[PDB]
Amino acid sequence: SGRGKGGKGL
Amino acid sequence: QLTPFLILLRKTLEQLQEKDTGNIFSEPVPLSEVPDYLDHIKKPMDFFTMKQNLEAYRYLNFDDFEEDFNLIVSNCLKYNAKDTIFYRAAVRLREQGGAVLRQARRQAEKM
Amino acid sequence: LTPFLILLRKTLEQLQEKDTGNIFSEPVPLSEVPDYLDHIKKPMDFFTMKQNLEAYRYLNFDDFEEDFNLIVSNCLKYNAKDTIFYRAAVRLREQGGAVLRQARRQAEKM
């Protein structure tokens, strides 16, 4: 996986 | 009626929250914005719901109060990926909360 | 404007309807996800599919299906399992694979 998009849900 | 035990749980609830600067756990995870949350988490919990419960006389012993705190942490570890702000915060909260709960239970069981 | 192009248009809108959160509506935002292209060789999303469609680049159904499958596989690859994105792609695999099955039957008559 990459770093990720973060956040919680949308 | 307002008891010494309720007063102690109020204080304890506030101590658990001082450890949470981002107010990550202050209110329910917002289901509008997190529409998959209930597909993975059976019983959501957060500090405001705990305060509602406390003030409505639903924590008449220490175990039931600790159970809901522990749910805040375990739900967060379960829902979120490890490499996240939220999962890291729940690991830290486990650590810091475990200690606050240890001393509060000692006080409670003398009542 | 062929029966085939008309069919792919309809099919694409049906696939989009499966994505209620519009997670796959547009390219993953590279300004928010700066390492996306270090992992994903061929990004895809429904708006790019619409551009391809309207520019006559879907000669056949296999090429269209290949791009849909990329939307899903890219998302499973990039994201951790326990994310809204990954979970949504797993649901889209199922619900979108079914849309494609019915559309393919129609395409193969043309």
TrEMBL record, chain A:
Complex formation: The nucleosome is a histone octamer containing two molecules each of H2A, H2B, H3 and H4 assembled in one H3-H4 heterotetramer and two H2A-H2B heterodimers. The octamer wraps approximately 147 bp of DNA. Found in a co-chaperone complex with DNJC9, MCM2 and histone H3.3-H4 dimers. Within the complex, interacts with DNJC9 (via C-terminus); the interaction is direct. Interacts with NASP; NASP is a histone chaperone that stabilizes and maintains a soluble pool of Histone H3-H4 dimers.
Organism: Homo sapiens
Gene this protein is translated from: HIST1H4H
Bias type Gly residues, positions: 1-10
Family according to the record: Belongs to the histone H4 family.
List of residues that carry N6-acetyllysine: K5, K8
Coiled-coil stretches: none
Highest taxon listed in the record's lineage: Eukaryota
Function summary: Core component of nucleosome. Nucleosomes wrap and compact DNA into chromatin, limiting DNA accessibility to the cellular machineries which require DNA as a template. Histones thereby play a central role in transcription regulation, DNA repair, DNA replication and chromosomal stability. DNA accessibility is regulated via a complex set of post-translational modifications of histones, also called histone code, and nucleosome remodeling.
Protein's cellular compartments: Chromosome; Nucleus
Protein name (Swiss-Prot/TrEMBL): Histone H4
